[PDB]
Nucleic acid binder design. Structure first.
Length: 151
DNA sequence: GCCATGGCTAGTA
DNA sequence: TACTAGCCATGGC
């Protein structure tokens, strides 16, 4: 049974949907998974220094159920890339499987139903360029700046 | 299944 | 820089 909850943040009211089974989707407005998520974020923003101490919630969304490239990607990304780090679309294609399929990672990230958590903002253009971003480019930038990046 | 698309890239003039 | 032509896993239809 899908449940939703809002929470203030530097990015604006973040609304987290999800049931007892796992986190469904982190959306930006401007049960056990929610209690962990609403703590992981509240941590990430206001106490990034220690984000490893917090539990990554169970992800329920229909994207994590059916096996695909997308799933491998989102996974192969959440695992590999951590706070302050960054990985190129191609560097992430190589990880999930097809090193040529960097482009399809775009929509993968576009489609990512759990931004921040699953760091989509850490995926940038190969040219070093920050790249575009689903919830509006300003965010991707504020986040990386947040994660100690120079701009 | 066929085809348009988009958050990619390396190359080229 | 500006622009182009492979490469690719999706989502409509």
């Amino acid at each position: 049974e899908m449940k939703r909850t809002t929470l203030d943040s530097p990015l604006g009211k973040l609304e987290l949907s999800g049931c007892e089974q796992g986190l469904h989707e982190i959306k930006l407005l401007g049960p056990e998974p929610l209690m962990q998520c609403t703590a992981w974020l509240n941590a990430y923003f206001h106490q990034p220094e220690a984000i490893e101490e917090f539990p990554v919630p169970a992800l329920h969304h229909p994207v994590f159920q059916q096996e695909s490239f997308t799933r491998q990607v989102l996974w192969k990304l959440l695992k590999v890339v951590k706070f302050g780090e960054v990985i190129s679309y191609q560097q992430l294609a190589a990880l999930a499987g097809n090193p040529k399929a960097a482009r399809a990672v775009g929509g993968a990230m576009r489609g990512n139903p759990v931004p921040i958590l699953i760091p989509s903002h850490r995926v940038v253009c190969s040219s070093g360029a920050v790249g575009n971003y689903s919830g509006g480019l300003a965010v991707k930038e504020w986040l990386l700046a947040h994660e100690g990046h120079r701009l």
